[PDB]
Structure 1
Amino acid sequence: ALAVNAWKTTALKNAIAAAQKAGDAAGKIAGESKGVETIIGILEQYYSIYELKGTPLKSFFATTHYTDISNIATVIDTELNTSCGLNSLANQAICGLRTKLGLVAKMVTQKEAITKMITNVVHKSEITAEAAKTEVAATKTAAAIKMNTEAIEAA
């Protein structure tokens, strides 16, 4: 069976490349979800930031990308200033961020500490997203190539 093995040879090469692209597609989507999910989790537990611009973080990160450090940092810095000045009220939740950012003199502005904090947070959420992408891509690829090889070897 010369002609039979020749086409199965090409079929299997294509099945491999298809199962990898199927895995990447699924992992890419899994990564995006996991990244947004991770930054929200960090800001809420570690920094008790539960809203920005009057809205829950889930809504905020629909219009601001979770990796957009410069935008995220500016919004947090602006919100601290408008909510936590001497004319401000009510012990707003975001005001606690100042103590969490180690500003006391032991030389960093508030905006600089926030920028480093968010850079740190975004880096952790990107690599956590990358891990989820890696797992989901591998699980899908394994299941796809197994299914496809068994088909070609049985045809």
Structure 2
Amino acid sequence: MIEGAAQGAVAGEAAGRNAIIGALKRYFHIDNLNGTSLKSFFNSTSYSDVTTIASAIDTQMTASCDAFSGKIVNQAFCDVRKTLRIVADPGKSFVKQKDAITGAVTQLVEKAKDTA
């Protein structure tokens, strides 16, 4: 009785973490965030905390898709800048990366909970 409410509660938390992790992996083609695995990343921060995840993804994108670093192992992650119209297009106004990431993460968390 008491320990099935326990296994039930962690089964639900696992399915939520799994939903957001799959969504971030499939959309950003990333397996790690902020120096740790996405499963390890979601032990400390909430599964629907759009602001924290978007800021961490922004910081990682600026750090791993730069002109200085040389060879970028993960091109697909940087390629997301083209999806979010973040790459410079002559004649048009600036699109901030953090804001586009925030909108994307918003859709992804809504989609994961929509699974729920």
1:77 aligns with 2:58: yes
Q: Which residue of 1 aligns with 2:110?
A: 123
Percent of paired sites with the same residue = 42
Answer 1 or 2: which has greater helix percent.
1
Q: How many residues are matched?
A: 106
Map of 1:109 onto structure 2: 96
Which structure has the higher relative contact order (CA within 8 Å, separation 6+)?
Answer: 1
Consecutive unaligned residues of structure 1, counting only runs of 5 or more, are 1-21, 131-155
Alignment deviations for residues 30-83 of structure 1 (CA, whole Å, 9 cap, x no partner) = 432221101111121232111112221111111111101000000000111122
Question: 2-side partners of 1:77 and 1:91: how far apart?
Answer: 16
The CA deviation string for residues 5-30 of structure 1, in whole angstroms up to 9 with x for no partner, is xxxxxxxxxxxxxxxxx99x94x544
- Is residue 51 of structure 2 the alignment partner of residue 67 of structure 1? no
| Superposition TM-score, scaled by structure 1 size | 0.59
Say whether 1:52 aligns with 2:46.
no
Q: Distance in 1 between matches of 2:79 and 2:44?
A: 25
Query: What is the CA–CA distance in structure 2 between the aligned matches of 1:99 and 1:59, rounded to whole Å?
Result: 28
Q: Which has the higher Rg, Structure 1 or Structure 2?
A: 1
| 1:38/1:125 contact within 8 Å kept | yes
AA aligned to 2:86 is L
Corresponding residue of 1:99 = 82
Task: Provide the rounded CA distance (Å) in 2 between the counterparts of 1:64 and 1:89.
Answer: 32
CA contact (8 A) 1:52 1:79 kept: yes
Question: Is the contact made by 1:43 and 1:49 (CA closer than 8 Å) also made in structure 2?
Answer: yes
One-letter amino acid of the counterpart of residue 109, structure 1: K
What's the TM-score once normalised by structure 2's chain length?
A: 0.76
Paired letter, 2:51: S
After TM superposition, give the deviation of residue 86 of structure 1 in Å. Answer: 1.3
For 1:22-33, list aligned pairs within 5 A: 26=8, 29-33=10-14
- Structure 2: distance between partners of 1:61 and 1:100: 25
